[PDB]
Amino acid sequence: AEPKFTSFTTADFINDVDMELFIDAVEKTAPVWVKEMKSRGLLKFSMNRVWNKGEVFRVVMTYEYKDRASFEANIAYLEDTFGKNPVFLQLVTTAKFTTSRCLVVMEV
Amino acid sequence: GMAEPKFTSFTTADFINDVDMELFIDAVEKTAPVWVKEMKSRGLLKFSMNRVWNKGEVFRVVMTYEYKDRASFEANIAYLEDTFGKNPVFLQLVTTAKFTTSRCLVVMEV
Ligand SMILES: CCCCCCC(=O)CCCCCCCCC(=O)O
Ligand SMILES: CCCCCCC(=O)CCCCCCCCC(=O)O
């Protein structure tokens, strides 16, 4: 009946200082936003530092949801908490973010 | 995070049309009994293929390879270049697709 959903968000930063501020902020606050996202059916999150694209400061973040309802619930949470929050938005003002939303086709 | 971090690669595969993309998904699914066993024996923890639906009119999957560590990643690249590189065949399939890979270290996971 129910496909799984996974999102890949690539965050690109001007320099190391900016990326390190983001990473530290994400890690430090995880105890709150992870609890909330898991209560809504996030299965797993990961942050991944890109190493094969030269001198860039780039992470890929992965969000693995149980199903559509979890995906939708977690989008609403992230909008409310971060996307619509001008103080957070200012924290990453010169960063570029781009997300690919996916249906899981095959996993082994 | 870890002294010996996990490694993860994300390959994005783009196709000209739906036919070409499903021919690829099917190929990857059908040959899995060979390659999955081989990669896991070299430290692949997990593989996934993911259809991207939010980029409008594109035909595109993201493939994720989750490795135990740097050595496992390296053994797996070795295996793949040995195998699919020097068994083409595979080369002709991937010939109309465009592939781009982002290779990473895991900073945090939960
Ligand atoms: C204080 C800020 C640190 C906390 C940030 C937590 C976090 O998960 C980053 C928000 C990025 C939003 C983009 C993700 C898109 C989600 C999706 O499409 O599934
Ligand atoms: C065309 C079918 C033959 C077998 C293909 C097996 C498969 O897993 C797809 C390989 C696509 C190339 C991606 C290799 C990247 C691995 C990495 O960087 O970690």
Side-chain angles (χ1 to χ4, degrees), chain A residues 1-34 36-65 67-83 85-108, chain B residues 1-69 71-80 82-83 85 87-88 91-92 94-110:
Chain A
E2 206 67 51
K4 297 167 69 178
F5 282 67
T6 302
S7 301
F8 302 100
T9 302
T10 299
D12 196 57
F13 300 86
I14 299 307
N15 50 47
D16 208 59
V17 170
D18 294 351
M19 185 192 60
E20 288 305 321
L21 182 52
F22 177 75
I23 292 176
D24 291 350
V26 177
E27 280 185 346
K28 190 68 169 71
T29 58
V32 170
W33 63 258
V34 173
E36 291 293 344
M37 290 193 82
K38 292 201 171 176
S39 79
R40 291 161 177 83
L42 175 87
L43 292 164
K44 175 180 175 190
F45 164 98
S46 72
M47 174 169 31
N48 302 273
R49 168 78 189 271
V50 177
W51 58 260
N52 73 318
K53 301 297 184 176
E55 303 306 303
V56 297
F57 310 94
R58 192 176 301 159
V59 302
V60 173
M61 285 164 301
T62 68
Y63 309 81
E64 288 176 50
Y65 304 112
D67 56 23
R68 190 188 192 281
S70 308
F71 162 67
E72 182 182 66
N74 273 301
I75 289 330
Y77 171 80
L78 288 170
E79 284 173 352
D80 297 343
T81 313
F82 302 106
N85 187 303
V87 174
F88 169 77
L89 260 25
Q90 183 64 35
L91 197 74
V92 291
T93 193
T94 56
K96 282 89 179 138
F97 292 80
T98 183
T99 302
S100 284
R101 300 186 174 170
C102 304
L103 294 157
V104 181
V105 173
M106 184 194 150
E107 57 194 334
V108 216
Chain B
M2 302 309 97
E4 188 70 54
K6 292 154 73 146
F7 268 51
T8 300
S9 298
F10 305 94
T11 297
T12 299
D14 261 70
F15 305 88
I16 279 195
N17 59 46
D18 191 65
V19 166
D20 283 357
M21 179 186 48
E22 287 306 320
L23 281 159
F24 186 82
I25 280 108
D26 191 49
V28 167
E29 289 171 334
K30 285 186 179 158
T31 62
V34 178
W35 61 261
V36 181
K37 195 176 76 271
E38 293 291 347
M39 294 188 84
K40 291 200 171 168
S41 74
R42 294 170 170 80
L44 187 72
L45 290 172
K46 186 183 152 174
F47 169 89
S48 73
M49 177 156 53
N50 304 272
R51 165 69 180 297
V52 174
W53 53 262
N54 75 316
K55 297 299 178 186
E57 193 172 28
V58 299
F59 305 98
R60 182 182 299 163
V61 297
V62 174
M63 295 185 287
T64 71
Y65 298 87
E66 283 169 53
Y67 309 103
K68 195 175 101 181
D69 50 29
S72 302
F73 157 76
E74 289 176 7
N76 273 294
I77 295 327
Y79 163 74
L80 289 173
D82 239 281
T83 301
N87 286 118
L91 289 178
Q92 181 64 285
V94 305
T95 224
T96 192
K98 299 194 166 162
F99 294 87
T100 52
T101 304
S102 283
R103 305 187 158 86
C104 306
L105 322 183
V106 178
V107 176
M108 204 229 84
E109 76 177 68
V110 65

